[PDB]
Write a protein that binds this ligand. Structure first.
Ligand SMILES: C[C@@H]1CN(CC(=O)N2CCc3cnc(Cl)cc32)CC[NH2+]1
Ligand SMILES: [Zn+2]
Length: 106
């Protein structure tokens, strides 16, 4: 499914932080639910799988070192919610650092 790159959220029912919070329930996982919700994510009830309310972008297998905002940027760089909240300069930073993380191991 293609990532939503318009200024209009794919899932408007999940546009409020509070609405997103409710989707998690008791959350055992490596990453903080509040932090996820702040980064636009709501839980699907399929392990730790989350989707952004805006771009629709899905992410799973959250490691303790993985930051919701950085991951959002890494995998869904066209997301307009991300651009609004963080700005393009943060977005470019994250891409630069992840691209440079690759050439440092490769
Ligand atoms: C949090 C981090 C996410 N990472 C990538 C990931 O989960 N991706 C890459 C694109 C994609 C599409 N659809 C789903 Cl469901 C997941 C996903 C894996 C390690 N943990
Ligand atoms: Zn998004």
């Amino acid at each position: 499914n293609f990532p939503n790159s318009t200024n209009l959220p794919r899932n408007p029912s999940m546009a409020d932080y509070e609405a997103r919070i409710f989707t998690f329930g008791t959350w055992i996982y490596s990453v903080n639910k509040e932090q996820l919700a702040r980064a636009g994510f709501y839980a699907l009830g399929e392990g730790d799988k989350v989707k952004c309310f805006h771009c629709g972008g899905g992410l799973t297998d959250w490691k303790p070192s993985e930051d919701p905002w950085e991951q959002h940027a890494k995998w869904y760089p066209g997301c307009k919610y991300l651009l609004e909240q963080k700005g393009q300069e943060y977005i470019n930073n994250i891409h630069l650092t992840h691209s440079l993380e690759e050439c440092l191991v490769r």
